[PDB]
């Protein structure tokens, strides 16, 4: 297995997948690595299994249909995976914890949002449809863009949002256009 965390690329107390060579810190994996006995498969493998069992799930979908899906176990899993893919990017650090807003000539957003809050909302099964999860994720980057305006720091929001949207389109097999 790998000797660094798949998500944050650091060594430490790592948990190894049994069906692939990836390794994870306990709380870098989403969901947090399960304490159940042998064996254990990481979310990459579990997502791969889903895709393989239903090859046609890779055909193109409309975003509108995807967003209205109820958060049944497989949809819950896909959102956990999509969230993890965002954490995999180092620039996710800027969006992980609770933000604060005190900048000359800017007012903070009406509804602050950050990745650890979305992670907790997923863990506590607070989203009933995919739409709720996607809206909170997109809110993170929209808040950032509105607040920093013309400061070049706005680009971080654009970069991490691009990561989110590419993985959304891939994981949920959105029709190519
Ligand atoms: N291109 C690599 C690849 N994508 C998939 C996939 C299967 C079902 C739904 C979404 C994606 N499987 O392999
Ligand atoms: Zn890690
Ligand atoms: Zn694995």
Both 55 and 101 in a single domain? no
CATH number for 4: 3.30.40.10
Q: Secondary structure of 69-121 in the HEC alphabet? A: CECCHHHHHHHHHHHHHHHCCHHHHHHHCCCCCCCCCCCCCCCCCCHHHHHHH
Whose CA is closest to atom 2 on ligand 1? 170
The minimum-distance atom of ligand 1 relative to the CA of 48 is: 12
The experimental method behind these coordinates is X-ray
CA separation (Å) from 4 to 16, 23, 91?
10, 6, 18
Distance, CA 107 to ligand 1 centroid (Å)?
Answer: 41
Please state, in angstroms and rounded to a whole number, the distance separating the CA atoms of residues 135 and 11: 33
Mark out the alpha helices in the chain (DSSP H runs): 43-53, 63-67, 73-87, 93-96, 115-123, 130-148, 154-171
Please state, in angstroms and rounded to a whole number, the distance separating the CA atoms of residues 5 and 114: 22
Tell me how far apart the terminal alpha carbons of the chain are, to the nearest angstrom.
38
CB 163 within 8 A of CB 83: no
Residue 24's beta-bridge partner residues? 15
Neighbours of 128 (CB within 10 A): 10
The domain containing residue 81 runs over which residues? 60-177
CB 140 within 8 A of CB 95: yes
Distance, CA 66 to ligand 3 centroid (Å)?
Answer: 25
Distance, CA 127 to ligand 1 centroid (Å)?
Answer: 24
User: Looking at the 3D structure of the chain, how many domains does it have?
Assistant: 2
Regarding the beta carbon of 174 and ligand 1, being less than 6 Å apart is answered no
**Length of the chain (residues):** 177
Both 75 and 18 in a single domain? no
The minimum-distance atom of ligand 1 relative to the CA of 50 is: 8
Task: Please give the backbone phi and psi of residue 14, each rounded to the nearest 5 degrees, phi first.
Answer: -110, 145
What value, to the nearest 5°, has the Cα angle with vertex 11 and ends 8 and 13?
A: 105
């Amino acid at each position: 297995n790998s000797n660094i965390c798949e998500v944050c690329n650091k060594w430490g107390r790592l948990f190894c997948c049994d069906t692939c060579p990836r390794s994870f810190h306990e709380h870098c994996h989403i969901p947090s690595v399960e304490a159940n006995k042998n064996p254990w498969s990481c979310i990459f493998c579990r997502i791969k299994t889903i895709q393989e069992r239903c090859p046609e799930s890779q055909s193109g979908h409309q975003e509108s249909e995807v967003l209205m899906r109820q958060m049944l176990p497989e949809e819950q899993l896909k959102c956990e995976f999509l969230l993890l893919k965002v954490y995999c990017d180092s620039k996710s650090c800027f969006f992980a914890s609770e933000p604060y807003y005190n900048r000359e000539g800017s007012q903070g957003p009406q509804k602050p949002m950050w990745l650890n809050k979305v992670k907790t909302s997923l863990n506590e099964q607070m989203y009933t449809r995919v739409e709720g999860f996607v809206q909170d994720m997109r809110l993170i980057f929209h808040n950032h863009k509105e607040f920093y305006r013309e400061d070049k720091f706005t680009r971080l929001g654009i970069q991490v949002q691009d990561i989110f949207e590419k993985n959304f389109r891939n994981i949920f097999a959105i029709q190519e256009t």
